[model samples]
Target: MISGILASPGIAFGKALLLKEDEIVIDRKKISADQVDQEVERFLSGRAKASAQLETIKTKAGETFGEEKEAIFEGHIMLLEDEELEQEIIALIKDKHMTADAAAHEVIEGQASALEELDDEYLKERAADVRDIGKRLLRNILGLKIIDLSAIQDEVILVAADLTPSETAQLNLKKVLGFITDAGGRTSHTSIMARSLELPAIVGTGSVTSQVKNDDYLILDAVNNQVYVNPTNEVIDKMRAVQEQVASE
Candidate 1:
């Protein structure tokens, strides 16, 4: 038993799918007075791309998981398209004579800091949301792409340090039996989505990411808040019975 906290209750067993963290940045550079239009236009274009991608995710999740999950992405789209957000970023670019990515980065990051500085973890929860949006915008402007979870076409249990709201929204739940995280709580977005999707989840098991690797045979007995790696046939049969009981509940 790995003894992770239960975020969602069910019995799930599958191969592990470990997700690694992504990191990036571009050179920070100031722009010219005459080039403000080009800089602002780049920011606007990137905003549109991010909005379109989010809209696609919202629709797909709406189809698979219904209105609740759809609304999650709707909230992301609205925050990304906020007039005040656009205005603030554009003003920063124009005033600071900065590149669009940097301007957007500074503005959105400030908002994230506001939430992070709050004592409430719930408030800090939104910090990931804000930071994720800016990161998407930066990716769009920089023409970058990361691993797409939607392309995962196998039955597996996802293992990650944490899943951002955007990543959770893109999950192919049919292919994803369940998930575990090295860090997160019941209030985290990933945990919330797990409940909404009815996927078994165990989170806040520190360094599970280090101990578990891709394609390890795993059993997540979320009902009992335990994980077993490579259990014997006897244990598997017991877990199978427990899973049936969980389903009957």
Candidate 2:
């Protein structure tokens, strides 16, 4: 059994839905001086779209889940509303003559790095939130498809390198049996949301993404913090027995 930090409690046995982190590439070409206004407008447009999307998700989360889960989306909305962040992106576009995509991406990366360096746990976690919003804005600017976690056709155990709060918030527990991630601790927003949704999750696996492939069988034993990947039938039965014992208790 592969060990990992138990972020939520329960047991699940299902095929893996390996989710590799999608790399977002942007054009960094220098723009003409006359194009600065149009570029800034593009950035503002992306920001507005991201805000509206966040608000819609926030309302849906509050209605479907509860206020506690919806509160995370509020933090995301505040990041979009940051005046300094907006100024930084606009300055990069005007001063460096960079595309709005590049300016926004660079500025967001800087903010995420700084937040990650903080000693406070809460602030460190905010780094993920900042990056999440930044990526949404970038996608809007670049015309890329926004990643959606609620698109699964069948139930499976989700394995990913990392899942940002915004992405995790969109998960449908009905089809998402459990989730295992390479990054994040118990205090990470993803973990907190998993707990609130009563979904079994194990995080900080460090290498689960590299170890498992899509459709591989996985046994997630959150009670003992172990993930049995491609286990034998005997091991599956053993876990089922344990699950029964826990339920009976």
Candidate 3:
């Protein structure tokens, strides 16, 4: 049994679906003075796409999963709506000749770092705010494939390093049995969502991603804070029996 932090209750077994963030490279290639308008337009276009996408996600979250997630998306949209932040990034592009990708990435990281320095536990923990925003805009700018948790195939347990709250929100209820992450704590938004949805989850394993792979069998005993990866058939029966025993108590 691999000991880990339990983020929610219950027991489950399923094939693993390894989730990793795809590479996002920000081009630092300096733009010539004449190209500033086009570059700024690219930034604005990405920003608009991110904002519109957030608005829809926010509305749906409010309509479905209720307020916590809507509030989460609202915060992200508000960040994009910050005119000063936009101006700061645009200034970097116009004055420093940095690519829009680098400018947005740097500015967002600055905000994430500042939030991490604050005293509020959840706010500091949720500094992923700028992280999600940065990637969304960056992907739009670069035309990278967006991470679509909703489009997942087969019933599987998600294994990842860290799943953003918005990413967690998009997961299919029926296909995603539970999830485990290499890094997270009670303050992590993924943890919050897991418990809120009562999905079986164990996090902070540190080696789950390295030890497991896509489609590997997993017996997640969240109530006991243990994960049995690719265990034998007898072990499955044993765990299956214990699932009932735990439920009885």
Candidate 4:
């Protein structure tokens, strides 16, 4: 069994669903003053789309997981609707003469950095939340699309370098058995969501994404903070017995 930090409490035995880290590339360009209006509108439009998506996610999560899990989306919606964030982006376009995407990238990076510098653990995790929102905004503005985990047909343990809250929120528990990430502390937003959904999870497992492949049979034991990859038949049988005991609990 591979040792890692337990982010969520539970047990899961399933095949791995390897999620590669998405490296977003943004084109930084300068825009004329006359184009500022169009740029601001672009950012606003993306914000609107992101807000709508969050509302739908919030509703579905409430129904499927309960009010607490659904509440996580509320914070996202608020961040999307934050006037200061929008105004800051607009001003950067108008004053800095940077393209909307560039201005947004700067604003988002700055916010995340500032949040990370704070002493509060909750606020530090908010850095991830802010970045997640920013990534969605940039994706919408850039006309880029991300993987849809909602489409997965079978339950599997997700292995990723890290998952944005938006991406994590879209995961269907019916298909996602657990989550393992190479980055993020126990207080990260992804960790909070996993607990709320009752999914077993381990985070800050440095380089787990490189170690496991897609469809590799795996055992996630949150109680012991261990993940067994391609275990022997005898170990699998013993794990199944343990899972039964946990389920019965």
**For this target, which candidate reaches the highest TM-score against the unseen true structure?**
3
- TM-score of every candidate: 0.77, 0.78, 0.83, 0.74
Please give the lDDT score at residue 232 for candidate 4. Answer: 90
Question: RMSDs, each prediction?
Answer: 3.8, 3.5, 3.1, 4.1
Query: Where does model 2 exceed 4 Å of error?
Result: 5-11, 116-119, 183-200, 221-225, 233-249
Residue 220: error of model 1 in Å? Answer: 3.8
Tell me the lDDT of candidate 2: 0.77
Residue by residue across 101-163, what tens digits does model 1's lDDT show? 787778876889888889997778788777877787788888887678987878888988888
Per-residue accuracy of model 2 over 64-164 as CA lDDT, tens digit each? 66787777788677778888778887888899898998877777777889887888988887787777777777787777876566677887778888876
Q: List the residue pairs that clash in candidate 2.
A: none
lDDT of 3 by residue, 41-114 (tens): 88887777877877866776766687855777787787787888989999999989999988888888878899
| Candidate 3 ranges beyond 4 A from true positions | 7-9, 117-119, 183-188, 222-225, 237-249
lDDT, each prediction: 0.78, 0.77, 0.78, 0.76
The residue pairs in collision within model 4 are none
| lDDT, candidate 3, at 63 | 67
User: Residue 72's C-alpha lDDT in candidate 2?
Assistant: 76
Error of 1 at 222 (Å): 5.1
**Model 1 segments beyond 4 Å from truth?**
7-13, 33-36, 69-72, 117-123, 183-199, 216-226, 229-249
